[PDB]
Symmetry: C3
Subunit: 256 residues, 3 copies
Amino acid sequence: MLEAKFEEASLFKRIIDGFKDCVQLVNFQCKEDGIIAQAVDDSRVLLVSLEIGVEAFQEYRCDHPVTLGMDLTSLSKILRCGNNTDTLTLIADNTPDSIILLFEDTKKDRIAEYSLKLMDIDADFLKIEELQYDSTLSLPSSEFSKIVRDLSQLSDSINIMITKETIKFVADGDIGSGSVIIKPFVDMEHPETSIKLEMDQPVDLTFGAKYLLDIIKGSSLSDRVGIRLSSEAPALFQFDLKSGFLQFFLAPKFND
Amino acid sequence: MLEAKFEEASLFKRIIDGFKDCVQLVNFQCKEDGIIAQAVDDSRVLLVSLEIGVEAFQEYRCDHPVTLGMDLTSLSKILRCGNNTDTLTLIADNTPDSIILLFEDTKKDRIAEYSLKLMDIDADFLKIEELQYDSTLSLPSSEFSKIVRDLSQLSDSINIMITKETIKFVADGDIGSGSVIIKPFVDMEHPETSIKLEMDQPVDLTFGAKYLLDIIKGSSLSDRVGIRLSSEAPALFQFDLKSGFLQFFLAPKFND
Amino acid sequence: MLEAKFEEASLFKRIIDGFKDCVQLVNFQCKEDGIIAQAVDDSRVLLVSLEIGVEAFQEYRCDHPVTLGMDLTSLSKILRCGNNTDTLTLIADNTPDSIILLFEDTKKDRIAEYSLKLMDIDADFLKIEELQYDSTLSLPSSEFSKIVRDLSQLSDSINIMITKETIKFVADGDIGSGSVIIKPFVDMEHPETSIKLEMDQPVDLTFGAKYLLDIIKGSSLSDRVGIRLSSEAPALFQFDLKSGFLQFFLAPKFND
């Protein structure tokens, strides 16, 4: 058997919401210490890696590793059936016939049970994560979402430029151009609004605006967002969960 | 002459809102003791029966029976002209040239007058209502709306199953299946949230999901919804008004 | 150089919002005493005239007249980048290479800079404004917006009729007809809700409903709206700003 209970069903919906767009199908590997999942879009420029620890649940029981894959559209449509305050339980037994989703409310009444059919996918798992990245920065997700949403209307490509103590987001298209310059600072009212930055080597990268808009969806999961950049590898966008995280690996556009 | 004044225009809009979809044209018969109306959709699987007593109005005057029919789209577009707190007056004189709608506000000012042209329809009135139904249940409209809206995403058909002290809503489609089981209970905080059920004979019926979504619109008219079921006749969905009601007769899908 | 700073960026967005529809391109002439702009739609039945005084800004500096034209769509898309509480600064230097837009927040941080390319337009400026109009009236913008939005669903033409101490809005179409009659009154709670009217000669005009719906957009700029009517010339719809205004000249439909 396999039982995983989210305290609030909102968490699982938001997590799948990061998966909802920019990818069709996903493979969830469950084991004794939690669940992990990798998914790559059709153009293979974006990889989404999810890890959810035991502490993110209120109840977790896995007597046996278990791999279950499912269509995100089919899964998202079934994740439109519960209150965001409901308790959500996932059920599977050994060889997975199919996955069971179970909703429950505060008033011990109105029990909804669902069954999503499972699929067969290729286990080509990627460990492209790097030891050291050329530059690293963190900032409020709301601020970063604004920056991307603003510049997206100008062009299909967004450029990120980092120098010493300076972060510069630049977009340039048909109707014109725009730029947002932010600098590291520590705000003591709430140390959350702080912008942090560590630079080993200056970086200059360009990303497809289409894919960045898909990445910023993780703002519903965390107050802050982590960005690890390097001119040698895809960028790493990370959203922290309670004892877990959701990662977005995006390959820069290149070259002249 | 004929004068019928709704205290709040919201009531008439919501009543027509139950008519807005799942039917094109409607025939309103007015007389000394109120108004009644029947309408059947194109496929003749759904019949909508409305009855509005004198007490639902604040003022009603009818010196003569009078039948007036009108296009719901044309009527709904004209019901988008007033505040939901306005006083609405319907005016007609003997042989109906056309119907007059009159809006009025708290501040005795801003008087809006409208004139909707009338049509000729066939008076084939149906009295298919049954003496005794095999089973009867009532429950909060909000709860019932959730159950239908949830299961609708799974398939085009929804199955309702009733056994002794047990009500089971089941849907089964391509992407998977789902089920909601509710049981009778009396909640004394508000006796409104109570689920009631009386069974003479167990029933198992299947309905087109398209039509149920049209029926649940009556939730804006009442706190509770009444469902009378039988394996021999169309189901009866009833929403109570202040001294009136709105009914939905739906024929089950059948058979193997 | 040329620097014009709006206290709140919301003002400029709403002003362009009156321009957003019912016209494609606009020519902004800036000089020592403020900015003015004229724009005519494709069918040449509607002229939009804008005037913004120095006092509408918090800061204004113009060492030299300067004419700059720009696409409204391109401009509106770039006006979707700031909070409605931001400070907006427009920058240009002598012969305009292109216009610069600059956003700033309360927390002296997050500086966004943009550059919209400019165009070449024909300076055929119109002074069709009349000395004396046959009739003049003013009323709450919210009330006038309701009247237009209501009657618009009935037909493609709206008729305005003015007699002694009487204002009558009438629409007549396929599905039926409607009419709204308002009369002059002074309400002392707030003298804003007052309806004023001065008649030299009674007027009866008909306007394209398509264009009136575009005109009522100025409601986001002022509490009241001014309407100057005449059977000899296009109607004048005026929305007052803080030391400025936005005007709509609309030619009546004519004739039998």
